[PDB]
Amino acid sequence: ADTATRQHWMSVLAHSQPAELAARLNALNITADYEVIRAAETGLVQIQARMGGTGERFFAGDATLTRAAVRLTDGTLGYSWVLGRDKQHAERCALIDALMQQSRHFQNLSETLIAPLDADRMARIAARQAEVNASRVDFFTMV
Amino acid sequence: ADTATRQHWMSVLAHSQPAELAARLNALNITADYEVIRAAETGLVQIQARMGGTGERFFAGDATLTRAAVRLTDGTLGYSWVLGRDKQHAERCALIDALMQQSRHFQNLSETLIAPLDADRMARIAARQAEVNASRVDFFTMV
Amino acid sequence: TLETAFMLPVQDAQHSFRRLLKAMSEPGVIVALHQLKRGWQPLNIATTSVLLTLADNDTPVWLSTPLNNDIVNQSLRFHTNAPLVSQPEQATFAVTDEAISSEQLNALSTGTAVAPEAGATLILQVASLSGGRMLRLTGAGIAEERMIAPQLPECILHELTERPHPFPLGIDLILTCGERLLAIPRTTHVEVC
Amino acid sequence: ANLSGYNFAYLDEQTKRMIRRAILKAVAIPGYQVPFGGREMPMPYGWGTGGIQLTASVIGESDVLKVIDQGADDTTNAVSIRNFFKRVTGVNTTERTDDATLIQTRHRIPETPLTEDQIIIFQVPIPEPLRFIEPRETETRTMHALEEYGVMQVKLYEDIARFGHIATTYAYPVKVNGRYVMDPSPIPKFDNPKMDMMPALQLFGAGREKRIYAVPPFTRVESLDFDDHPFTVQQWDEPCAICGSTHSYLDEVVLDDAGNRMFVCSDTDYCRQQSEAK
Amino acid sequence: ANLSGYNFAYLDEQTKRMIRRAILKAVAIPGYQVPFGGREMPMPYGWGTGGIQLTASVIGESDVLKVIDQGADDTTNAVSIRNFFKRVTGVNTTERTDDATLIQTRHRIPETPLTEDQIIIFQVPIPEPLRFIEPRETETRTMHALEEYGVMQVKLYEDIARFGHIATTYAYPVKVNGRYVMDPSPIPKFDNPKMDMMPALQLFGAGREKRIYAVPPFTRVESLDFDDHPFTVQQWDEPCAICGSTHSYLDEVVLDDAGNRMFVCSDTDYCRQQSEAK
Amino acid sequence: MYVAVKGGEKAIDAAHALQESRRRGDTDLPELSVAQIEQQLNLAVDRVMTEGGIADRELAALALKQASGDNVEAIFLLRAYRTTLAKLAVSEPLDTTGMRLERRISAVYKDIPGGQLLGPTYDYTHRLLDFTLLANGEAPTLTTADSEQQPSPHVFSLLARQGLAKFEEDSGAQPDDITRTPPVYPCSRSSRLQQLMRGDEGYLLALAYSTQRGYGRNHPFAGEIRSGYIDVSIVPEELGFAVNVGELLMTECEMVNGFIDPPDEPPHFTRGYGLVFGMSERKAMAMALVDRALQAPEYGEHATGPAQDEEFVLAHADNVEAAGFVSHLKLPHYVDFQAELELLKRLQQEKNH
Amino acid sequence: MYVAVKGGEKAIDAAHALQESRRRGDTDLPELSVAQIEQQLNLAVDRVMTEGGIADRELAALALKQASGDNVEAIFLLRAYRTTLAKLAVSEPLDTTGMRLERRISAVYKDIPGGQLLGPTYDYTHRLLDFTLLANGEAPTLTTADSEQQPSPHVFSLLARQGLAKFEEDSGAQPDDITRTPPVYPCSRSSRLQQLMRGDEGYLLALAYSTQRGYGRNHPFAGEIRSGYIDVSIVPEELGFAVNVGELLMTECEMVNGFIDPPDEPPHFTRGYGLVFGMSERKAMAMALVDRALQAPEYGEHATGPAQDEEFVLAHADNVEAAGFVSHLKLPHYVDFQAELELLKRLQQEKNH
Ligand SMILES: O=P(O)(O)OC[C@H]1O[C@@H]2OP(=O)(O)O[C@@H]2[C@@H]1O
Ligand SMILES: O=P(O)(O)OC[C@H]1O[C@@H]2OP(=O)(O)O[C@@H]2[C@@H]1O
Ligand SMILES: [Zn+2]
Ligand SMILES: [Zn+2]
Ligand SMILES: [Zn+2]
Ligand SMILES: [Zn+2]
């Protein structure tokens, strides 16, 4: 379940708005010494799609992808792959990924950094879904 | 030569920037009672072009055209046909066209309204021509 | 000096068109065009209403000599812009009275096989729509049959009965009497009863 | 009333008059595609511009307008067109077929029989019934002029030889007044019989393709078929799930991902009448 | 030097290596259009991308680059390409043919004979000499594979029968190494002889069409012609108005609206050399 | 049991509100002004004017803003707005020799009378994304040369005077107007050019490109491309003499094409013509190329590409029609599809019998 | 006598400065921001992303700003920028069933599981120019419904379960990549779809429209159009398990096409597929229509329209290539034209002899 947890928090960081993550990390005032293994680099992720949504693969263009990697003093490696071109955001995501692998930070960050971010994204999504569902065409109602 | 003079001042009014004409007419403080024969109306002028620039006619789309007409107390009729949709500008152009047909106003307006407007347009044109001519490609110079 | 057109051009033209559409789609049915109160004499109310509804700069109009009057021409030009042509073959709308000749009738455009709509519509002013030789009409627009008795010229009756022009070619006939009119399209089978 | 700043019915009088002349010519030449100088509407080409122009050229203040799409008044495009006409004319509107003086429709003829003085206006994408056999107008025009309809008969016979049935299921070609092969618009074959000897005037507008044609009242309209493969209309094993009718064109509503579906009348006014009768 | 933030010569190493393998294959197969996975450049397709990619894949720090268009270094596109290469490589550049190690050209071969170790890189719109006879690659590929060149010979013979002359005046097809019919790029017929048994290596890039081909040094290049209609180069009644040369391709400069014109060498470096000699 | 409910009107209103909110976007950002689009997105405006049929920059920018930058939707908006306006006049024929030049180039001669005037162009730029545009910057202070416009005769006039090309003569033929009468194939060149000017830029560009690749080759050279201000004049019935109503920014392209050798005259270059509103040129070039391609019947040319197929090209050129009809598939089609389904189910049952 | 002078570089610099000044426009107006273009001209951005090959809204808006709204120039800018970037990963195949829906409609059934979700659309709007946009306004306060997204299975899945259509099966074939190897005709469907996604919107729209008018008919019904956010995942070599790198706004179109009766299986509907970045749909619809048209060799169909001619369609679809080659005629061509002139003058002299 460790891999699933790492995937989940990396996902949450990858989907976070850079501004909110930066604000939340500044507020938590985490003191951690790290060195950048791989400087935040912006390149492309080639998008594979499927014929008919389910069939043979074909290349549906590319998207911008920024990747970063850091190492902590104890050797823990943090990584980040986020769509877009925000190098600072990628560095922050990699730092949080490294920290979340340390027993001293996993619980605290999960309660105060990751869960809050996921909840905010879910709230925004729910609001947008309500607005969109206003446009649903009603035809029949069961009596 | 009267028709040429009327064409010239109508042209000058038609090519004038509405703001400068409005400012210049406000400044001249011309007291003239007039009634609008035709309320400023915006429609289309169909553009006829020529094959190869010189041959058979063909219709190259349309452009917006605003027309206005006024009558002075003495029966003089002023008219205006200007590209665009500025009804107030068309009314002003028609009023000036009516006034310019009155002997009491022709000389004064020509010296203080029409000539100044034409000179300003020519100056703007000359400046733009200088800027554009900066892009001319030089190949040979006669020695 | 010029005659007066519809008092409410939009609404009156629409009403007249709907009446004329009823007439053309149901041949032999008499309709009344009441919007215009005085026709441009010698043009009757129905003829003038049809011209005001349909005629314009795109539709040349030919008026036969008995119906060609300077005031009528000036009013038509002013109220519709419709160009007035002196030759029947150049007309989209042809206006005539009982005195229409066979030559003028045969001069009218019938359209072509590929462009059957490119012909002329004949507005004929009849003395009466009720006291002529009884005609039995069959075809499109008529459920079983319809019996009329307009007072028609011999040439017009020959045109209707014999149909020299092969379908889809042919002229569409609008018979006008006062404020009333009836329509016989090229498709109507006409038998002298 | 009309209180939107536009001319009544949104068309200038010149366009109305041109369209009216086209309508009269179409009536006089049943089934023949009359070209007309149609204009761009607030609806995109292919969203009913021809029907809109026809209705605008025929409609008056006392008309009661019914607009339907797929047989339903509440369809998105039906609502759009009807709201547009309410804005630019102010005419009374109805969902009841028997109270409508003008019926503008897309792909259905109402189950309720039409009556004298009613006009039904069809929205037509492809006014040329030979288009899918012969894509070029330069050829189909001549074929209509010369009554050269063999490619259509060959298409039907080849369809029978290949599949055992005529492949066309909607916009089924029809011979009008014994002469003209006409496209009845994208109505399902179920509706084609209603066109034969109908007391109402039928108008057909193809705005994008710039054609108007007409079937006058009480005109023969016969679907092309064979004696041993006679014209047959759509059938369903189920009645309407709401009103129980077995005589109406049915639309298939997919209820769940597990394959559960129901069938309900496409003609919602007819469905309401049937439901109120029971 | 390269101080622009881009890799040397602006191409990533993978693209350079792919193009280099393509160049080697092209050299080993003279006249054959080698497909290659070309990339979009800062110049639009059709503005020299193939030549740009070839030069980027071959150029080094010690190379002296000459870029010409219509035979002139100062042409707009020549200036653009040369400035781009100065930005992304920092290489020395020259207008002198005899001092250039790399010559990238559009539509001219310099009058000054090329020498060993020089590489001339042609910009090619249409790498297929049969394209205007046969628009489809699916056919021209097979024709090159099977050496089925009859349509070209028929084109030439029909041209002679119609006009009395071969109609093609630039991009004149040439047989290379006795086997491959090749497009020499849109150089005038005047330049085709220079391609035969030349000490320099000739490279040809069609970026939009994704082809690279080559003529190694000292390779036979023979323009397709007839014995009684032999290959003839462009001629003019006037010499160069500047240097007086009668042996150079001339460009016609229209001086005034009254029909006054002059003729001047297309090869501006050659013209400067001739003017300095006199 | 199931009961029908009304949902169309409210769903439509909600959808339109959603689209309007998306068009506004983040309210923290200032709302775009039509003036800003007109000034700084001027090439999109040029395309919208040319294909919408109205040469009013402000209206085109308004349509673009309303269309959320969708050029097709904006073109349709302008085209539809055209229908609501009255035709107050018909211009006298344009005289492109009087154009006040912003740009004038010729590919067929190194230098020409009047010179190669590049003007404002993206030609010869290195298409490297300029990230400094992510923040406010300063436009370059333009250098200045002499203000006089040198005589710039049309290159085709210089060709024709030599006998290399044929002057385009005016016989007084009345132009066809496809805005008033539907096209009748084969169309006159006037109708074809009117339709091409209104045609989809991408479609015509692809057709011209195919012609360059051998599918109906016309051996084109860019004889002259001019972009500048041309005066518009009318003759009102009120006054009876010509009045200048202003000027329009237009681009004109004259292409030299493949020469021909007619039986009873010297061989000469053929030619194509393109004319558009604004500065965007490639529409004019493609229009000239496709115009030459559609000239095939005049020259007895055997068609080798779809660009020479008049009906195929013109019937599908107008993106108002094409976009509308392709989008109409989004409309409910379930009656039709039910008609298809019934047939298919019967066919399957019969095959499986 | 005449002496050559250097004019190319300074003329080019002046031309580029002129274009930059025109792009800035009237300095009294605030300079457009890339964020504003991204938010309020989002459909243009969608087109630029789809055809430029990079799904980065900010970069597409930057290209549009730099291109003065010229969609073709912006597409080329983004496409060129692609060349400077490294491929850091290849995504796992997209799974459109996981899309977070902004819009979902189906024309083949009145109502479907998950409902007809119109979302933000201009469909059913009356295209009347909204002059209130000439000044600042207030966006509508959106009404709200339940926030839950109902299950929205693909309509083609419901078709295939009935046996009316065929599931698109994955055999594991390696997709062709036309960005690394030039296309080889006939191309696989993967290559054809990759090219169609990059193709000119107008060209493909016109081709699809021609197919609707009988030039290679495919009897299309809009089986389903979805627009929404789809998650992108990769498998980095560093970690060896899948990571979600974010989500992209994409539109997917599945077209039901004319049924076929194969020798040894029940007759079934054919189908077409379209996929684009952003909300703009008509590109996806045209892509599906042309994909079905180019499926002709698979189904042994006799071609009746250019839309079925694979080489003609695909070789001229990319507007980067087409626009570049049409514009290249603006380049100096006087050497070739001189050769042409020499031949023509000799022909005239010989004829006049
Ligand atoms: O050309 P228009 O604008 O008059 O639209 C006519 C018809 O074309 C489309 O195809 P459809 O039959 O599915 O329904 C739509 C519309 O009703
Ligand atoms: O495809 P590319 O980008 O490599 O451009 C090759 C050639 O295509 C155009 O045609 P051209 O011969 O006139 O000159 C241009 C250019 O040099
Ligand atoms: Zn029911
Ligand atoms: Zn010289
Ligand atoms: Zn449809
Ligand atoms: Zn070229």
In order, the DSSP letters of A87-139 are HHHHHHHHHHHHHHTSHHHHHHHIIIIIHHHHHHHHHHHHHHHHHHHTTEEP-
Residue type, A29: N
G266 assigned to some structural domain: yes
Whole-angstrom distance, CA of residue B93 vs CA of residue B84: 13
Regarding whether G97 and G243 lie in a shared domain, the answer is: yes
Give the distance (Å) from ligand 1 centre to CA of residue D50. Answer: 8
CB proximity A84 to G under 8 Å = yes
The dihedral of CA B84, B89, B95, B98: what is its sign?
negative
Q: Are the beta carbons of G87 and A59 separated by less than 8 Å?
A: no
3-class DSSP assignment, residue G123: coil
Q: Are the beta carbons of G124 and D126 separated by less than 8 Å?
A: no
Distance from CA of B140 to the nearest CA of F (A): 9
Q: Is D106 in the pocket of ligand 1 (CB under 6 A)?
A: yes
Instruction: Report the Cα–Cα distance between both ends of chain E, in Å, rounded.
Output: 37
Give the distance (Å) from ligand 5 centre to CA of residue G159. Answer: 19
Whole-angstrom distance, CA of residue E126 vs CA of residue E184: 10
Tokens matching residue A5: 């947890």
> Helix, strand, coil proportions of chain G in percent (round to 5)?
40, 15, 40
Of G5, G14, G17, the CB nearest to B139: G5
Q: Which residues, at least 6 apart from E237, have a Cβ–Cβ distance to it below 8 Å?
A: none
β-partners of residue C130 are: none
Minimal-distance CA residue to ligand 2 atom 7? E125
Q: Which residues, at least 6 apart from E265, have a Cβ–Cβ distance to it below 8 Å?
A: E71, E111, E240, E242, E243, E245, E248, E249, E250, E251, E271, E274
Give the residue numbers of E marked as catalytic. 31, 240, 243, 265, 271
Interface test with F, best of G316, G318, G341, G351 (most F CBs within 10 A): G316
Q: Cα B20 vs. chain centroid, distance in angstroms?
A: 12
Residues of chain G neighbouring A57 (CB-CB closer than 8 A): 93, 170, 173-175, 190
Ligand 1: nearest atom to the Cα of D51 = 4
Whole-angstrom distance, CA of residue E233 vs CA of residue A94: 68
Structure solved using which method? cryo-EM
Which is nearest to A62 in space by CA: E261, G270, G78? G78
Per the structure, the count of domains in chain D is 1
Size of interface C-D (CB pairs under 8 A): 105
Residue type, G29: L
Regarding whether G124 and G52 lie in a shared domain, the answer is: no
Torsion of CA E141, E146, E151, E156, to 10 degrees: 100
CB proximity D80 to F under 8 Å = yes
Cβ-contact B22, B89 below 8 angstroms: yes
DSSP per residue over F129-174, as a string? --GGGGS-------------------HHHHHHHTTSB-------PP
Whole-angstrom distance, CA of residue G278 vs CA of residue G292: 22
Q: Which helix (H) or strand (E) holds G249?
A: strand G243-260
Which chains does chain B touch, 3 or more C-beta pairs < 8 A? Answer: E, F, G
Regarding whether G267 and G236 lie in a shared domain, the answer is: yes
CB proximity A67 to G under 8 Å = yes
Instruction: Mark F287-317 as b/e (b = at least 16 C-beta within 10 Å).
Output: bbbbbbbbbbeeeebeebbbbbbbbbbbbbb
Of A59, A60, A85, the CB nearest to G56: A85
Q: Are the beta carbons of F5 and A143 separated by less than 8 Å?
A: no
Task: Output the CA–CA distances (angstroms, integers) from residue G5 to F112, F125, G17, in the order listed.
Answer: 15, 22, 22
Whole-angstrom distance, CA of residue F241 vs CA of residue F235: 5
> What region, left, alpha or beta, does residue F42 occupy, with left being phi > 0 and alpha being psi -120 to 50 degrees?
alpha
Residues of chain E neighbouring G343 (CB-CB closer than 8 A): 165, 167, 169
Q: Are the beta carbons of E75 and G8 separated by less than 8 Å?
A: yes
Distance from CA of E106 to the nearest CA of B (A): 18
Q: Is D50 in the pocket of ligand 1 (CB under 6 A)?
A: yes
Cβ-contact A77, A87 below 8 angstroms: no
Interface test with A, best of G48, G58, G91, G171 (most A CBs within 10 A): G91
CA nearest D10 in G: which residue? G128
DSSP per residue over G30-78, as a string? PPPPHHHHHHHTHHHHHHHHHHHSB--HHHHHHHHHHTTT-HHHHHHHH
Whole-angstrom distance, CA of residue B10 vs CA of residue B16: 10
Distance from CA of D54 to the nearest CA of A (A): 29
Cβ-contact A42, A91 below 8 angstroms: no
Domain range for E130: 1-278
Residues in chain B: 143
Say which residue the tokens 């009859």 belong to: E150
Say which residue the tokens 């007072």 belong to: C151
Tokens matching residue E146: 């099977």
CB proximity D61 to C under 8 Å = yes
> What region, left, alpha or beta, does residue A35 occupy, with left being phi > 0 and alpha being psi -120 to 50 degrees?
beta
Regarding whether F268 and F143 lie in a shared domain, the answer is: yes
Domain range for G68: 1-88
Tokens matching residue B81: 């046909």
Domain range for B11: 1-143
Instruction: Mark G185-213 as b/e (b = at least 16 C-beta within 10 Å).
Output: eebbbbbbbbbbbbbbbbbbbbbbbbbbb
Distance from CA of G100 to the nearest CA of F (A): 16
Residue type, E133: I
Q: Is E108 in the pocket of ligand 2 (CB under 6 A)?
A: no
Give the distance (Å) from ligand 3 centre to CA of residue F142. Answer: 74
Cβ-contact G298, F195 below 8 angstroms: no
To test the pocket of ligand 2, the residue of E47, E84, E126, E169 to mutate (highest count of ligand atoms within 8 Å of its CB) is: E47
Torsion of CA F106, F111, F114, F117, to 10 degrees: 60
Per the structure, the count of domains in chain G is 2
Give the residue numbers of D marked as catalytic. 31, 240, 243, 265, 271
Of G7, G15, G18, the CB nearest to B139: G7
> What region, left, alpha or beta, does residue A97 occupy, with left being phi > 0 and alpha being psi -120 to 50 degrees?
alpha
Residue type, B46: Q
Instruction: Mark E240-269 as b/e (b = at least 16 C-beta within 10 Å).
Output: bbbbebeebbbbbbbbeeeeeebbbbbbbb
To test the pocket of ligand 1, the residue of D54, D104, D105, D124 to mutate (highest count of ligand atoms within 8 Å of its CB) is: D124
Which of F48, F72, F88 lies at the terminal end of a domain, its last residue?
Answer: F88
Residues of chain C neighbouring D36 (CB-CB closer than 8 A): none
Regarding whether G278 and G170 lie in a shared domain, the answer is: yes
Interface test with F, best of D4, D45, D82 (most F CBs within 10 A): D45
Fold of C9-192: Rossmann fold (3.40.50)
Sheet holding F243-260, edge to edge: B136-137, F116-117, F100-105, F221-234, F243-260, F268-277
Residues in chain C: 193
Cβ-contact E251, G4 below 8 angstroms: no
Q: Is E41 in the pocket of ligand 2 (CB under 6 A)?
A: no
Give the count of beta carbons closer than 10 Å to the beta carbon of residue C101. Answer: 13
- Ligand closest to Cα of D236 equals 3
Tokens matching residue G227: 């627009």
Cβ-contact G192, G65 below 8 angstroms: no
Which chains does chain C touch, 3 or more C-beta pairs < 8 A? Answer: D
The dihedral of CA D12, D17, D18, D24: what is its sign?
positive
The dihedral of CA E42, E43, E48, E49: what is its sign?
positive
β-partners of residue C135 are: C148, C192
Torsion of CA D143, D147, D151, D155, to 10 degrees: 130
Distance from CA of B137 to the nearest CA of E (A): 9
Regarding whether F213 and F82 lie in a shared domain, the answer is: no
SS3 letters across chain E: CCCCCCCCCCCCHHHHHHHHHHHHHHHHCCCCCEECCCCCCCCCCCCCHHHHHHHHHHCCCCCEEEEEECCECCCHHHHHHHHHHHHHCCCEECCCHHHCCEEEEECCCCCCCCCCCCEEEEECCCCCCCCCCCCCHHHHHHHHHCCCCHHHHHHHHHHHHHHCCCCCCECCCEEECCCEEECCCCCEHHHHHHHCCCCCEEEEEECCCCEEEEECCCCCEEECCCCCCCCCCCCCCCCCCCCCCCCCCEEEEECCCCCCEEEEECCHHHHHHHHHHC
Q: Are the beta carbons of G238 and A84 separated by less than 8 Å?
A: no
Residues in chain E: 278
Regarding whether F84 and F106 lie in a shared domain, the answer is: no
Per the structure, the count of domains in chain A is 1
Q: What is the resolution of this structure in A?
A: 1.9
Say which residue the tokens 């008049």 belong to: F310
Ligand 2: nearest atom to the Cα of E43 = 3
F341 assigned to some structural domain: no
Regarding whether F157 and F18 lie in a shared domain, the answer is: no
Residues of chain G neighbouring B141 (CB-CB closer than 8 A): 2-3, 5
Whole-angstrom distance, CA of residue E104 vs CA of residue E30: 19
